[PDB]
């Protein structure tokens, strides 16, 4: 039986108060949604820890056993909690069956919960009511016993045991510093996402979290086969051996020298090495070996070796008190021993070559017997590295002589010279290898390797997410193979739609109807076609006025750092090691300053057109053309309707901000200005002297200026100041519906916000230091040893605020493009009208009025689209006595009978007189000319 | 990386719907069918085939979002625009023009009556067809006439391999 | 740089393409008529007339 | 500037210490050294464009 | 301040007053108009807990 623990678990990780933020750790925690064993005794497993938690309404539960034996034999852990108090003792207990001294420890002091972890340390929770619900479990027992647990026992009603596991957590501590929630990073590719952004919250989008690699399975070895072997048997199974006094000495050179033979064997009666360990002697290599053979008495077998004394070690054979090398002696008593006795052996500086003999008979003891000693004195003498099969299209982790790596063995196609074991590629890469027991080449292929990114609707909508492994296929890693990698849980929808969440190489995703995250090729729009041909033209007869917004940013937060008290705050050990850097800290507060500055010099250059404030009249006419949402409200900050929902929108260590030279009350003060001037003077305030117009003219030029004679202003007036004053209601609806509106504004502020937090959390690095804190090094170390661990936190911050400048430097060559940008546009857009296309948003633009807004500006485009369009005939000129007649202006049109001359952005016929027409060349020149009469007043 | 799909949607993704040309080029004598797409092929002209001819450890390369034949289709789309709607589909509608008319408004709008156009129409649609020749040869002889993208890919396949050589 | 070129590359298109520009030398010597866009490995090539 | 190495002058360092040593001093000072190089042509790059 | 033949014929006590710390700062005996950060005010310690 078992149950599912939900999101149970969770404790205090440390003794540490923080409240009111979201912090990451990793440690044993029960991993969410894990399987815990549902009892209702045994012994069971301990693990890394143990997560227990029991549901009781008689408290029949009450201890534990912790141990690895858990009967006598050594120290067991016993927690009792029994009437009025609770017993813990660490003493060798003899326990029962079936339970329900040298003591080094002793102690007296529903839904409960605990966690036992390795010192021991006791978590515990208690509430009323596995359910399912979220907490956290708090520290409560402290036991320096220093026991092993491996298993542990229930001393008895129902209970759940599950276990811990190293895995990061992202806890929530709210205002009073209370775990209320937890992410667990292992859980979900979305919990991923959420443990990456720091944040319970996911914003629609793609994210990178993590990195997918193939890992090797096994590896390979490979060394050639052994080519060379040194003739050992010559040495140790030589038919005749030599005297002491004059011994045999073989030299051992240019081989593979196995030394498992003579090690292992149980023919010798003795095996020692002296300078090197006598297991190490096949990994090891010795420049030469040189074998002395001779054959001596038993007794005296003890005297080879490095500081003896003795018959032989000081007249026949000895050895360097530093000696290196190893000592093998077996008996010779069948081989050697004659009857009569052998005499043929005789004795008497290091290796150093009156005689005795030695009576060696078959018969003697065994100290009288013969001994055949080989001493081995210790590059061309190797031991034998040892191979493995080599094994193909896999990811392995290969050995191939002196190279390593990681990669996928595959053939290749590469033609190696007869002398070239190793290939590379441009970047001095390995590409390919020889095998060194086979003549073949193979290529190495790195294994499988790509970004991790997941692909999620806002948390707001859904909770399903997609993976996409970048630049991998879909057999190393429902499942839909693209040019971007594979992409795993969203489906393959044929229809194409317009992009939302982006994979990339056409690929686009979204969350669509029951719902489910899918992938299609994006649309880049409708399709359609011109009804083009050499006699046929489209001319509008309607028109809307529509308004566009425009936001652009002008300047960044006038950030200032200090950089001698960020990286020595308030220590002058610290500061006399700054000043090694010289100007490094001086260099970092200039670059800053000059930042701060330009932010002002940006405002100024985008919003100070004007050098006079200009205010609109109580006299609100200006034909039907309502601006009360635009202009400032008198009753407030003089701010406009628009101006606030504007604003509305968007959010100790040597770190401040310095305030803008131009507050929020100064910008409204030249946005008001610039208003009352477009609205009142036209541009002319822009060129000199604002020239007073009344407004209906001041449109007859803004009309005339994109093609449309004035009086279609005057005739259609009612129709147009409608039209606007509508479109400036639609700005105010999207405005207030969507923050996403003022995403640009938004975006300045949070990459600066994401540059200061990235700044203050480096000082909590190490950067090899022993500590990330000045204070503890201060009062831990004297100066010869804390200038050392200083230079490196001075190195890392000096270093991170080098990154810092760097990139708000270029960062704010963006912005000030930016405030150029919105400089230009507002002399030409507002303090004039601009013939850019699509320069002041899409349409024939006629007017523009700026908005203040925090770190930028706003702009409402007011442009002329045509709305409704017919088909007419048309011709490049008409022919009236012969000769070819064109028009001043405008075009010939045909509705099937007539032919009339119109201008080209609003269908409006005239009759055509020699008064709209001109007179060039004939009709037997001009082609596509066409027969008419030319009204002659 | 996600700066770079913005500078490409900004550059080409300025027309809200793609448009087509018509089985007919009579376009008043001026011959576009070596910047058009070729519909019997990867779907690009002529010049656009010469213009991509001639350009050539923990690091990846990402895929653009929008692939060659989507920027294929944002050109052929504005040049479609701009030959047979004018100016007119970048303000708004796709109103259609006969071409000699739109060379017309061309020309007025440089300071030259649109008389001029029409009497000399056969003179300069055919100056324009050859100069469009002139384009095709000089970009097929000249490979350093693109010398401005091959060293964007010169100077960004510079600094991947300084990056993997300081490995060493 | 890039990103300046790009914003450069779409003003033209914009105002070169879309429009009929009237700043000298803006799109070619001469006195601008037309231009015509094609495609390009990592950038934009204009035609202009 | 000494970057921490008893000496802002090389040749300094070269004349009074032996390799084993004077490695380690002039090492101090090519990091300082190189580090204000990069600084240096950074600002410059950045005030070029 | 060293002259032409290396004798010192000024200086600024950079403690003395405010537009001392703005000379030492800008390394110079003359300040031109505007504003200039060359401190940060500190309240010390005064007892020790
Ligand atoms: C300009 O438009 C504003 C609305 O944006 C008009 O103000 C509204 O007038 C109606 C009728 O009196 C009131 O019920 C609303 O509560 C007013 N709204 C606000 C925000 O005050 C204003 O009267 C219009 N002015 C002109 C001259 O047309
Ligand atoms: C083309 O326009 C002309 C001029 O408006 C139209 O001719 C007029 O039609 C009205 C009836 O709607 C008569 O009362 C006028 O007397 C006509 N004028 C002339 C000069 O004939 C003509 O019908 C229109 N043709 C088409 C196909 O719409
Ligand atoms: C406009 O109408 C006139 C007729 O009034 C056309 O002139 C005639 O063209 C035909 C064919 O070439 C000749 O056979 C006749 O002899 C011409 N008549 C005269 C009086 O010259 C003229 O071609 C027509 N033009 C257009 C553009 O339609
Ligand atoms: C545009 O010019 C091209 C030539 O550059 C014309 O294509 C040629 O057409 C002739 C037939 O008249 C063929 O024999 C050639 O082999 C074609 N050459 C090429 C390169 O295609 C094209 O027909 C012209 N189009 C228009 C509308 O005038
Ligand atoms: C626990 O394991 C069983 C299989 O023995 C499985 O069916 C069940 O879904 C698992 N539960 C959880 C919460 O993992
Ligand atoms: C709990 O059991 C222990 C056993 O050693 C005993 O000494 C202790 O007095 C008991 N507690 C109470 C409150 O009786
Ligand atoms: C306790 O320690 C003594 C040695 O001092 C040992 O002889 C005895 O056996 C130990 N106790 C147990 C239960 O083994
Ligand atoms: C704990 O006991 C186990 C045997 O059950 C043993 O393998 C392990 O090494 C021991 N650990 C310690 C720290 O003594
Ligand atoms: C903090 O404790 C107070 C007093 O019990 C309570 O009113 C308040 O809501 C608590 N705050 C949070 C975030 O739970
Ligand atoms: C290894 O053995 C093979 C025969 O199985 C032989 O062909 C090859 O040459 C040998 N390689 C070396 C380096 O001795
Ligand atoms: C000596 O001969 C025996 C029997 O063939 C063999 O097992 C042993 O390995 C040989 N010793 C050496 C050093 O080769
Ligand atoms: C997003 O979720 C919050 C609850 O956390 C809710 O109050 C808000 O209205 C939701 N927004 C939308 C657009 O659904
Ligand atoms: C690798 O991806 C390609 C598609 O580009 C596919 O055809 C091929 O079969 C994939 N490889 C494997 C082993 O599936
Ligand atoms: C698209 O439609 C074709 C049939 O024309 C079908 O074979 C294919 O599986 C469909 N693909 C998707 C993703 O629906
Ligand atoms: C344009 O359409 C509107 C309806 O939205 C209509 O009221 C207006 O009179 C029309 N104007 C012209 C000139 O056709
Ligand atoms: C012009 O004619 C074409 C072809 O019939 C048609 O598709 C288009 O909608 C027509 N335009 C208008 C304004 O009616
Ligand atoms: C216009 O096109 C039609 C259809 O191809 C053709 O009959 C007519 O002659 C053309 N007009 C001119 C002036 O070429
Ligand atoms: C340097 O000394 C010379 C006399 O040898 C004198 O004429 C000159 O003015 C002095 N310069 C300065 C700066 O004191």
Request: neutral net charge; charged residues 15%.
């Amino acid at each position: 039986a078992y149950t599912n623990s939900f999101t149970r678990g969770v404790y205090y990780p440390d003794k540490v108060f923080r409240s009111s933020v979201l912090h990451s750790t990793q440690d044993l925690f029960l991993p969410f949604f894990s399987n815990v064993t549902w009892f209702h005794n045994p012994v069971l497993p301990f693990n890394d820890g143990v997560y227990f938690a029991s549901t009781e309404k008689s408290n029949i539960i009450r201890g534990w056993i912790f141990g690895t034996t858990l009967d006598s034999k050594t120290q067991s852990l016993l927690i009792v909690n029994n009437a009025t108090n609770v017993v813990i003792k660490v003493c060798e207990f003899q326990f029962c069956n079936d339970p329900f001294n040298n003591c080094t420890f002793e102690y007296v002091s529903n839904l409960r919960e605990f966690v036992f972890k390795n010192y021991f340390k006791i978590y515990s929770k208690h509430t009323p009511i596995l359910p399912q619900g979220f907490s956290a479990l708090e520290p409560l027992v402290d036991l320096p016993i220093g026991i092993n647990i491996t298993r542990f026992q229930t001393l008895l009603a129902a209970y759940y045991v599950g276990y811990l596991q190293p895995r990061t957590f992202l806890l929530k501590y709210n205002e009073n510093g209370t775990i209320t929630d937890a992410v667990d990073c292992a859980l979900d590719p979305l919990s991923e996402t959420k443990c990456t952004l720091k944040s319970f919250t996911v914003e629609k989008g793609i994210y990178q979290t993590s990195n997918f690699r193939v890992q090797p399975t096994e590896s390979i070895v490979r060394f050639p086969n052994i080519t060379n072997l040194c003739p050992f048997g010559e040495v140790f199974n030589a038919t005749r051996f030599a005297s002491v006094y004059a011994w045999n000495r073989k030299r051992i050179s240019n081989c593979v020298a196995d030394y498992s033979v003579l090690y292992n064997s149980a023919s010798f009666s003795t095996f020692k090495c002296y300078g090197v360990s006598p297991t190490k002697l096949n990994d090891l290599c010795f420049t030469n070996v040189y074998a002395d053979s001779f054959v001596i008495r038993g007794d005296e077998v003890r005297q080879i070796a490095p500081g003896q004394t003795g018959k032989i070690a000081d007249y026949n054979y000895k050895l360097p008190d530093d000696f290196t090398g190893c000592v093998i002696a077996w008996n010779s008593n069948n081989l050697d021993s004659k009857v009569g006795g052998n005499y043929n052996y005789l004795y008497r500086k290091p290796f150093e070559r009156p005689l005795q003999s030695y009576g060696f008979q078959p018969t003697n003891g065994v100290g009288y017997q013969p001994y055949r000693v080989v001493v081995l004195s210790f590059a061309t003498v190797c031991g034998p590295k040892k191979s493995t099969n080599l094994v193909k299209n896999k990811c392995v982790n290969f050995n191939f002589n002196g190279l390593t790596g990681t990669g996928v063995l595959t053939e290749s196609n590469k033609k190696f010279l007869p002398f070239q074991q190793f290939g590379r590629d441009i970047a001095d890469t390995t590409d390919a290898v020889r095998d060194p027991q086979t003549l073949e080449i193979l290529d190495i292929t790195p294994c499988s390797f790509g970004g991790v990114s997941v692909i999620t609707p806002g948390t707001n909508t859904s909770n399903q997410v997609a993976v996409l492994y970048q630049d991998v296929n879909c057999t190393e890693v429902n499942v839909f193979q693209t040019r971007a990698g594979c992409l795993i849980g969203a489906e393959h929808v044929n229809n194409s739609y317009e992009c939302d969440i982006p994979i990339g190489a056409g690929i686009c995703a979204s969350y669509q109807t029951s719902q489910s995250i899918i992938a299609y090729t994006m649309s880049l729009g409708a399709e359609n076609s011109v009804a083009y041909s050499n006699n046929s033209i489209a001319i509008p007869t309607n028109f809307t006025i529509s308004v566009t917004t425009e936001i652009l940013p002008v300047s960044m937060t006038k950030t200032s750092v200090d950089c001698t008290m960020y990286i020595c705050g308030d220590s002058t050990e610290c500061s006399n090691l700054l000043l090694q850097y010289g100007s490094f800290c001086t260099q970092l507060n200039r670059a800053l300053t000059g930042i701060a500055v330009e932010q002002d010099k940006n405002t100024q250059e985008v919003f100070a057109q004007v050098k006079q404030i200009y205010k609109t009249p109580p006299i609100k006419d200006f034909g039907g053309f309502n601006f009360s949402q635009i202009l400032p409200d008198p009753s407030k900050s003089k701010r406009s309707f628009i101006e606030d929902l504007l604003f509305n929108k968007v959010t100790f260590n040597g770190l401040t901000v310095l305030p803008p030279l131009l507050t929020d009350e100064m910008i409204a003060q030249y946005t008001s200005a610039l208003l009352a001037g477009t609205i009142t003077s036209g541009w002319t305030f822009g060129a000199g002297a604002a020239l007073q117009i009344p407004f209906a003219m001041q449109m007859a030029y803004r009309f005339n200026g994109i093609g449309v004679t004035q009086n279609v202003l005057y005739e259609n007036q009612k129709l147009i100041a409608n039209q606007f004053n509508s479109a400036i209601g639609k700005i105010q609806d999207s405005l207030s519906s969507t923050a996403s509106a003022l995403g640009k504004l938004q975006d300045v502020v949070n990459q600066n916000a994401q540059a200061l937090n990235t700044l203050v959390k480096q000082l909590s690095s190490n950067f090899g230091a022993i500590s990330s804190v000045l204070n503890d090094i201060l009062s831990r170390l004297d100066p010869p040893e804390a200038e050392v661990q200083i230079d490196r936190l001075i190195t890392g911050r000096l270093q991170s605020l080098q990154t810092y400048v760097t990139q708000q430097l270029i960062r704010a060559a963006e912005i000030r493009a930016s405030a150029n940008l919105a400089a230009t546009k507002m002399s030409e857009c507002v303090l004039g009208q601009s013939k850019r296309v699509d320069f002041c948003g899409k349409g024939y633009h006629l007017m523009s009025f700026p908005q203040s807004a925090p770190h930028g500006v706003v702009f409402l485009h007011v442009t002329y689209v045509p709305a409704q369009e017919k088909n007419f005939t048309t011709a490049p000129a008409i022919c009236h006595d012969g000769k070819a007649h064109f028009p001043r202006e405008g075009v010939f049109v045909s509705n099937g009978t007539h032919w009339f001359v119109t201008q080209r952005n609003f269908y409006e016929p005239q009759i055509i007189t020699t008064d709209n027409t001109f007179v060039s060349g004939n009709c037997d020149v001009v082609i596509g000319i066409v027969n008419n009469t030319v009204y002659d007043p």
